[PDB]
Amino acid sequence: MKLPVREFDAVVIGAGGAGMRAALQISQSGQTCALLSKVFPTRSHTVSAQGGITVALGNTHEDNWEWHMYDTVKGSDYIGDQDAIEYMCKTGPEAILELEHMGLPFSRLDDGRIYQRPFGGQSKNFGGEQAARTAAAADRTGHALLHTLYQQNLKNHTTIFSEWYALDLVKNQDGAVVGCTALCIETGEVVYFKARATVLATGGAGRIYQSTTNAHINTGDGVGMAIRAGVPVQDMEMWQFHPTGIAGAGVLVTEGCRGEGGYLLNKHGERFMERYAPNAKDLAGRDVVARSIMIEIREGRGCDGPWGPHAKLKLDHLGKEVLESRLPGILELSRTFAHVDPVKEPIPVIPTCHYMMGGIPTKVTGQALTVNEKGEDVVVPGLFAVGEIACVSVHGANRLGGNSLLDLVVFGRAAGLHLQESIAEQGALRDASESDVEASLDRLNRWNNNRNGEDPVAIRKALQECMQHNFSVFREGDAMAKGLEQLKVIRERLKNARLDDTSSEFNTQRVECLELDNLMETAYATAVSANFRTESRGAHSRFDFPDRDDENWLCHSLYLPESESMTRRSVNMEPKLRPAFPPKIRTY
Amino acid sequence: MRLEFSIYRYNPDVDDAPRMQDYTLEADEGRDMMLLDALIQLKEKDPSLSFRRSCREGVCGSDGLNMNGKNGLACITPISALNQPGKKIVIRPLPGLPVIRDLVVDMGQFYAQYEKIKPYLLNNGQNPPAREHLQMPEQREKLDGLYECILCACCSTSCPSFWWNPDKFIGPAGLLAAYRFLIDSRDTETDSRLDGLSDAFSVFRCHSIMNCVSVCPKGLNPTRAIGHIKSMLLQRNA
Amino acid sequence: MIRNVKKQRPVNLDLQTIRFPITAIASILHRVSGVITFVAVGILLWLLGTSLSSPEGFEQASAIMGSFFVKFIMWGILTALAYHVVVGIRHMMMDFGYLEETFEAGKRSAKISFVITVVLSLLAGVLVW
Amino acid sequence: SNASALGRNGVHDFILVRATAIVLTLYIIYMVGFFATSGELTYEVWIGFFASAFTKVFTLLALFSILIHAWIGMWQVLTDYVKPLALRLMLQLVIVVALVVYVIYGFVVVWGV
């Protein structure tokens, strides 16, 4: 026995928006808990969030959470659970005001050019909502939310392990998750964090494409750990490509623009979104608005220039003031990366990878589930997931704008509020032999001994490229087929990949490499899923199957791992709730 | 064109003292790229080279580095602003703070000072609001330029006062954050907060050098913030 | 490395390696100008001492001031002193509110200051003579 | 409350420095105005300028303001560069004595004229 151990009644892997909201709640419950992160908590991808948080507060105008349900169910394509969404939308307000009581810098209401109302959180008009239900604090709502939450773990003295890299989960002889292992990026030592509850909140991994809004950190470490451990992933092909990404930059620009009155136009001067969604206009859903512009590029009718085939996001018409008071963060990203002042000229926008709706399947309490021999939902002892890494089945097949953040807090808090109870249920969990622990150290030992292998940059590049072409907005059988094979080619290749730096004091390479494996398992699952599904729903668009299969494909595709052994694909669904809800026509 | 770089290197287990290593990254003279881009490439040529990066868009605070004598974010410092024919591009770690490896410094002392000033809302709870707190736009306006700090420490790193008293003088970023709560209508411990900053170092080590304003990526002005804190003190202790 | 404990991390602190704004130069000189002045009072007191002691004393002082080497020193003191007063006032003005705390407004303040200093320095030199 | 610092706290030091700065600025102008209106200084004119109650009282008010001012200032400088305790206290001691002597010598010179 030579490996160090750190016992906690909980381990929250991830310091994003959800990871902290949970670490906080779990601590309020008098539960000893360790919080881990690859970067300093304030650097997690959440800081980059803009738009805001869509929640029914009723400040901008009277509203009810149910309208939030309809706007969202039809938004997912009846692929998102009514039970979970209900809970979220309903518990929405209370959870958000909670954040304001924590000191979150929300924008305020009262006087404006042609508007007027009390101190409520300012709610902006957003995509997928009949009216304005988006609480926003300037263009930097994520930054406000992430910092507040950190400030909170500062007050409540949460134990934080900053810049630690979680490797793989550690299984119990009875097949339960009992903590995990992690690397101290600073010193390089490896340690086993043993816990009666292991919470994953490692965000998404849009890095498996060549142009994404995500950061260099979103590598799906989470997804990789789940599969290499034995845990499935739901709807892992459902990827929302944001409509207004920046052409050539991949840097994001808020939907709030259209919300404040932004135009999405074509070179011939028409607002093609008005023609596509005849009555909903630019407010049209995520999945829909993407194909609209992307299409205008297929027909050779998309604008072009140094940046590339883009679509003009006209905003200049709005007052320079309004743009500076409501979208300050936008006015800069455009000049900085797009070399264009939105105050006078539109923005070269294009649908780029954004939110990953797929991820570890979980109950509302945040517990992780797997199927039974029969194919029944079986909770995984000692494992929970919250945030983007989790498919609680809320966004379904199309994440409504500003709901992810609302997701983070609600379900992040939900896991916290329920933790003690869940542990009670699973009961006691037995130790792990050095064998179990040793197992998780495999991926590390491999990389550290193999030095004459192959250069990971190529593997990485290839990986993203293939995903980019064969699994873009629009895709088809033949395509997936080739890519799916290419991947196997690369996944074997990756097995002989090398590690040049064998140092201790902050080894960025070693870390990045380790992340590669996750990129690999992640992209893979994405493919086998993408191919599998026989319909064109939400973000999924197949030219071969242009209509949604209500009877066959109205379910959650479950990617079936076996760690590194051969794979499989199954199904799942959730129609029952309290106020009731039927599928329907989806016209935005 | 070609690009000659000058990069700070140091590894506790190989090196026993720092050194400046030469680098050439022949890039396409097509367009301009950020310094992070260069670095990433160079890292492909040389793995051992370590540094921090993330959001990539000037919003996370990870890539704070001293470029040609001036502190900034590698993710948004164009190679245009740093290229001069015949001369090398000197990239070094943030000044004052200890070096963990290559261009990565221990930010410890920085976060510490941040904590000393109580970076969170303090509301005695007296007079609970029905729902959210009462914050008129005019009151919420007062927080602008004060809540956007991304903790990159470009400012503190550029302050001599902070070099001599890392742990006594709070520094630019921390005072900017102290002020964020001092003028927050929602915070009810202002007078208590002011008593905690009345010593001789916490605030008064600031000589209005304005290097902090000079380098802020976000265009924040700690000097001005510190000037208002000083006033509040005068009002409360005189 | 204390006794039987090693490695102390390095620090980037080569000043020639760092680029300083004009505002940074203004204030460090104000600091240097203060210490010079601190010593300066002593020298002036000494002189003032001689100067009033008696006629023979006033003479001896009038002659010491005669040396041109002394003239040069009496000149640095008055210049350092003038500098210190000007930057000191620039300082007190930003504190209260007669000057913007903006960077630009700060560089402009610093420049006008050195300018007034040089002029006074010149006057000082005419007097020493 | 740092023992070497004159001020009970920071705000105190801030004020005392500003207050003395103003007083000393007036005094300097006063002495400058005199020299720039002298031309050729005669022993009769020199002693005449000081035999004045007014010049005596201002000159001693400046000296006293220098004590308080240079005390705080020299103290701030030392706090930044001289980190070894024993050494720094020696200096502050040398400096405060020097300052105190400046004022005492001031008195002696003044009543002697």
Ligand SMILES: CCCCCCCCCCCCCCC(O)O[C@H](COC(O)CCCCC)COP(=O)(O)OC[C@H](O)COP(=O)(O)OC[C@@H](COC(O)CCCCCCCCCCCC)O[C@H](O)CCCCCCCCCCCCCC
């Ligand atoms: C707004 C901010 C305010 C600014 C503050 C900054 C102040 C510092 C800057 C100094 C600026 C000085 C400017 C002087 C000036 O203006 O000179 C004028 C020149 O003006 C022009 O050129 C006209 C141009 C107009 C253009 C528009 C007048 O100069 P003159 O023509 O009389 O030239 C001398 C002559 O040759 C004829 O010369 P002489 O033959 O009469 O000389 C004789 C010589 C020797 O006499 C002796 O032996 C007596 C010495 C007595 C020394 C006393 C020292 C007192 C110390 C007090 C300490 C108290 C703590 O005399 C010397 O050359 C005289 C030296 C004078 C030094 C005066 C300095 C005083 C400092 C006082 C405050 C000290 C504070 C300490 C904290």
Ligand SMILES: *Cc1cc2c(cc1C)nc1c(=O)[nH]c(=O)nc-1n2C[C@H](O)[C@H](O)[C@H](O)COP(=O)(O)OP(=O)(O)OC[C@H]1O[C@@H](n2cnc3c(N)ncnc32)[C@H](O)[C@@H]1O
């Ligand atoms: C990219 C993006 C996303 C975004 C947005 C703008 C941009 C540019 N604007 C949004 C908005 O207005 N409204 C909304 O509802 N969502 C918006 N989004 C999406 C949203 O940011 C994300 O869904 C959300 O940030 C996800 O949060 P989560 O907490 O789940 O994830 P994270 O913030 O990415 O942080 C993950 C954390 O986990 C740590 N980590 C990861 N792997 C490891 C390992 N192996 N070991 C230890 N820690 C790990 C990270 O370091 C990080 O702290």
Ligand code: HEM
């Ligand atoms: C008796 C002659 C003087 C001496 C020996 C003197 C000395 C000093 C010293 C040693 C410092 C501190 C150094 C530093 O921390 O930067 C200082 C600061 C200061 N002095 Fe003077 N001074 C004198 C006259 C004046 C005058 C006449 C003024 C008014 C214009 C003035 C205004 C200031 C100001 C505003 C500071 C603050 C600088 C800071 O806080 O960094 N001084 N002085």
Ligand SMILES: COC1=C(OC)C(=O)C(C/C=C(\C)CCC=C(C)C)=C(C)C1=O
């Ligand atoms: C306001 O700006 C500055 C200072 O003040 C707080 C400094 O302390 C220093 C550092 C100075 C050193 C090491 C030498 C000090 C010398 C003397 C004669 C007092 C620099 C570079 C500076 O820019």
Ligand SMILES: O=C([O-])CC(=O)C(=O)O
């Ligand atoms: O992810 C979303 O909710 C949409 C978003 O941030 C934006 O449009 O800026």
Ligand code: SF4
């Ligand atoms: S105020 Fe500016 S420079 Fe200072 S830490 Fe914050 S973002 Fe960085």
Ligand code: F3S
């Ligand atoms: S540089 Fe430092 S001295 Fe004050 S003006 Fe900025 S905090």
Ligand code: FES
């Ligand atoms: S990578 Fe975040 S600001 Fe540079």
Ligand SMILES: [Ca+2]
């Ligand atoms: Ca998800």
Ligand SMILES: [Ca+2]
């Ligand atoms: Ca208050």
